[PDB]
Amino acid sequence: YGFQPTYGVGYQPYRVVVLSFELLHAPATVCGPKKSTNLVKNKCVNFNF
Amino acid sequence: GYFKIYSKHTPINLVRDLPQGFSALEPLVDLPIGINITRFQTLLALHRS
Numbered sequence: 868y869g870f871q872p873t874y875g876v877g878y879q880p881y882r883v884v885v886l887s888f889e890l891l892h893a894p895a896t897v898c899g900p901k902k903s904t905n906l907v908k909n910k911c912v913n914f915n916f
Numbered sequence: 917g918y919f920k921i922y923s924k925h926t927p928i929n930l931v932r933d934l935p936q937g938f939s940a941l942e943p944l945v946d947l948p949i950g951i952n953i954t955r956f957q958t959l960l961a962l963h964r965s
């Protein structure tokens with residue numbers, strides 16, 4: 868290619884990243900976290916430690 | 917699919933044989949991977965000069 872700063876729309880360089888997820892039977896390790904909110908004492912509550 | 921390595925270390929004063937004592941082994945490292953290993957060797961160190 869001949870990429871130049873004067874190139875118009877559709878001709879300028881564009882950086883592309885493609886993410887593909889694979890689901891092998893091996894244990895999963897790449898996961899998104901969950902927001903741990905806070906702790907409260909002396910009140911009948913429910914918890915997910 | 918989990919390689920578990922448990923370890924322990926103790927001080928010894930008797931010369932050769934396994935001491936007649938009891939000491940549990942604490943869990944050290946887990947690996948969530950899967951391989952079909954069936955044979956294991958054991959390495960060594962030497963002085964070369």
Ligand SMILES: *[C@@H]1O[C@H](CO)[C@@H](O[C@@H]2O[C@H](CO)[C@@H](O)[C@H](O)[C@H]2NC(C)=O)[C@H](O)[C@H]1NC(C)=O
Pocket residue numbers: 892951952953
């Ligand atoms: C050996 O490894 C394979 C895969 O790494 C393990 O899983 C199955 O092995 C059998 C062998 O005929 C086949 O069904 C497939 O190759 C594998 N299936 C899947 C879903 O992975 C197998 O369990 C391992 N065996 C030992 C003794 O460790």
Ligand SMILES: *[C@@H]1O[C@H](CO)[C@@H](O)[C@H](O)[C@H]1NC(C)=O
Pocket residue numbers: 925926927928
């Ligand atoms: C190894 O042995 C020495 C004395 O023999 C002792 O002081 C030390 O704590 C021991 N270390 C381990 C890890 O058992």
